[PDB]
Design a protein around this ligand. Structure first.
Ligand SMILES: [Cu+2]
Length: 224
């Protein structure tokens, strides 16, 4: 259980973004059904919010997460898993993130050398998760998506056992990107409801065995 508080642009806190520039869900509950239209942007994913984070291609963004209060324990430390960041064109304010529209721009999963996950790093960083907006990005409005996946119950799949299954915590942020040039348009066209499957070894994942690696679902990080 976790959700976003705000976005920071090159270290500068843009301030509480909840229902302002983040499409904040009503609570911290996970998405588990891979056929849910909420998988892309969570339950209020289709409801527009009035502001866009102002940023430039190349900027370092920080997405800040919390559990119940800003700057708390962030997420239960049992919720080990990856954290991925994605981008889609802002087609209209009533878009909900469904369809073949996403490109992955950043990911972190399991680090064998420290036996730790993206989630442990998030906790250690007090909920701050950094990534770069690709410098080649064409200016325009975009939806950014960041997702924590918790694998404490991923040793079963939701379709067989709806009490268990991977837990997805997607957050969608509206961003208005100034270019530094660059004309690259995100083109992986990844669809979550089609591309995340119960057969994926990164979703049907048993963390309670002696694994050396974790396969992060979806395509590799977008090129240019
Ligand atoms: Cu939880």
């Amino acid at each position: 259980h976790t959700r976003m508080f705000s976005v920071w642009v090159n270290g500068v806190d843009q301030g509480d973004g909840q229902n302002v520039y983040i499409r904040t869900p009503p609570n911290t509950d996970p998405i588990k059904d891979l056929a849910s239209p909420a998988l892309a942007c969570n339950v209020k994913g289709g409801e527009p919010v009035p502001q866009f984070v102002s940023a430039s291609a190349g900027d370092k963004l920080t997405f800040e997460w919390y559990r119940v209060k800003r700057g708390d324990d962030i997420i239960d430390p049992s919720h080990s898993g990856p954290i991925t960041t994605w981008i889609a064109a802002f087609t209209s304010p009533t878009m909900d993130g469904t369809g073949p529209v996403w490109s992955k721009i950043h990911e972190e999963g399991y680090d064998a050398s420290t036996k730790s996950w993206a989630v442990d790093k998030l906790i250690a960083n007090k909920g701050m998760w950094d990534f770069t907006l690709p410098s080649q990005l064409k200016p325009g409005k975009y939806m950014l998506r960041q997702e924590i996946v918790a694998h404490h119950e991923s040793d079963a799949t939701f379709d067989k056992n709806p009490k268990r299954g991977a837990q997805f915590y997607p957050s969608c942020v509206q961003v208005d990107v100034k270019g530094v040039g660059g004309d690259a348009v995100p083109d992986q066209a990844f669809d979550f409801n089609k591309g995340y499957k119960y057969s994926d070894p990164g979703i049907a994942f048993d963390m309670y065995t002696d694994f050396d690696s974790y396969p992060i679902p979806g395509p590799p990080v977008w090129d240019a």
